[PDB]
Amino acid sequence: HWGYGKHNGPEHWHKDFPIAKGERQSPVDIDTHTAKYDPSLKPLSVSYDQATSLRILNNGHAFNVEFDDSQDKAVLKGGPLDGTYRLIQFHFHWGSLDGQGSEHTVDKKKYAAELHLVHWNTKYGDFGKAVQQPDGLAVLGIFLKVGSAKPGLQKVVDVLDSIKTKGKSADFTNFDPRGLLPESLDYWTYPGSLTTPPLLECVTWIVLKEPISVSSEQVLKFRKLNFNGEGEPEELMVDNWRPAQPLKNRQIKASFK
Ligand SMILES: O=C(O)Cc1cccc([N+](=O)[O-])c1
Ligand code: NI
Ligand code: NI
């Protein structure tokens, strides 16, 4: 019964999941000067035209916007990836304050939040099977800074009062995730893991260099969510980020010079 606190936070997770101290854990700090430009990188293809959003769920640690992943409707390919990866959900990690919230850091800089678009490798047939493989998932990570509003985020922000507490869901159809992407698809990539229990080492991370801008008001609304279930004492859903983990024997590659 894990979480983000003093008593059950990241620094405790290893007792239940020894893989917490493994060789390819996420997130990491991205040292921009040491990431090497890789000319082998094939270009990134994000194909979201046919995406079908279904539902938004407060899962007790974040909220997930879920997609129909029963056909190739929203797929990631190219980049460092071999084969086709299907979008299943996106979520965010965020802070109690604008000065922290992202999981990845860039030369030790923390962003206010980070968006994760989660995709699974179609060669494994379903998400559950994919998470058991070293190349099972591809997560596209996008940093959020506070400034101008992101218009394409507002639909997400406005439904959050309907999913305040753990276990609540709401219909969330016709959402276009293209409206959450920055202009450039320049990226860093490295092999890593999920950043919550069970911490599976199944992720190819693709972290975009260009952040998106969201307004202070937008992020504030994220911070009104609750970790707790309805009828339990209120604990604001903030600081649901795992800190940077040791890079160990990995290299971060850049798609750009
Ligand atoms: O890495 C995370 O943000 C945690 C996490 C936990 C469970 C599933 C997830 N997913 O990638 O579908 C992600
Ligand atoms: Ni538990
Ligand atoms: Ni995540």
UniProtKB/Swiss-Prot annotation:
Changing residue 116 to E: Strongly reduced activity. Changing residue 2 to A: Impaired activity, not rescued by 4-methylimidazole (4-MI). Optimum pH is 6-8. The modification Phosphoserine is found at residues 162, 169. Changing residue 64 to L: Reduced activity. Activated by X-ray, histamine, L-adrenaline, L- and D-phenylalanine, L- and D-histidine, L-His-OMe and beta-Ala-His (carnosine). Residues 1-256 form the Alpha-carbonic anhydrase domain. Keywords: Acetylation, Cell membrane, Cytoplasm, Disease variant, Lyase, Membrane, Metal-binding, Osteopetrosis, Phosphoprotein, Zinc. GO terms for cellular component: apical part of cell; cytoplasm; cytosol; extracellular exosome; myelin sheath; plasma membrane. The keyword Metal-binding applies. Its EC number is 4.2.1.1, 4.2.1.69. The active site is at 61 (proton donor/acceptor). Changing residue 61 to G: Impaired activity, not rescued by 4-methylimidazole (4-MI). Substrate binds at residues 195-196. It is an enzyme of class 4 (lyase). It is found in: Cytoplasm; Cell membrane. It catalyses: hydrogencarbonate + H(+) = CO2 + H2O; urea = cyanamide + H2O. The keyword Membrane applies. Interacts with SLC4A4. Interaction with SLC4A7 regulates SLC4A7 transporter activity. Interacts with SLC26A6 isoform 4 (via C-terminus cytoplasmic domain). PANTHER family: CARBONIC ANHYDRASE, CARBONIC ANHYDRASE 2. Target of drugs used in treatments against glaucoma disorder and breast cancer. It is linked to Osteopetrosis, autosomal recessive 3: A rare genetic disease characterized by abnormally dense bone, due to defective resorption of immature bone. Osteopetrosis occurs in two forms: a severe autosomal recessive form occurring in utero, infancy, or childhood, and a benign autosomal dominant form occurring in adolescence or adulthood. Recessive osteopetrosis commonly manifests in early infancy with macrocephaly, feeding difficulties, evolving blindness and deafness, bone marrow failure, severe anemia, and hepatosplenomegaly. Belongs to the alpha-carbonic anhydrase family. This is Carbonic anhydrase 2. It comes from Homo sapiens. The gene is CA2.
